């Protein structure tokens, strides 16, 4: 009810977190510490081998990971996290 309205808090694309994953998909993972709030980070990201990476492979459930916010969709209510960025730039 409350949290989505004042989502300025971590709005800036540059902002980064450490959140904890809930479950995996095969297109992402979802990393949800913010509580009542949850990102995704798509399988495109998480690696520098594009999709040559199953989410299960790089990360597993109940596992904390550093991530930047990239895109918040105020309405439609969906945040786009990035995991390949908060670690190396080879």
């Amino acid at each position: 009810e409350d949290p989505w309205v004042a989502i300025a808090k971590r709005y800036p694309e540059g902002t980064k977190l450490t959140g904890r994953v809930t479950n995996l998909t095969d297109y992402g993972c979802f990393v949800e510490i913010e509580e009542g709030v949850e990102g995704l980070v798509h399988v495109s990201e998480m690696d520098w081998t594009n999709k040559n990476i199953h989410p299960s492979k790089v990360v597993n459930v109940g596992d904390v990971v550093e991530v930047m916010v990239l895109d918040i969709d105020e309405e439609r209510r969906r945040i786009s996290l990035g995991l390949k960025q908060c670690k190396a730039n080879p």
Binding site: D26, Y27, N50, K51, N52, I53, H54, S56
Partner: protein
Amino acid sequence: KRQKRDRLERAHQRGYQAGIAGRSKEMCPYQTLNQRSQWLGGWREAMADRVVMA
């Protein structure tokens, strides 16, 4: 003729082709998560290209 082609590459191109032809993800014939990743990987790349085709 003497040796089977790369299974991962084939799986990635089968994915692409179901993609362009517009089948649903969840037609994917693989449960081997390794091949599965290739299949969907193709299928999603293909979803982009359909748009700019007629």
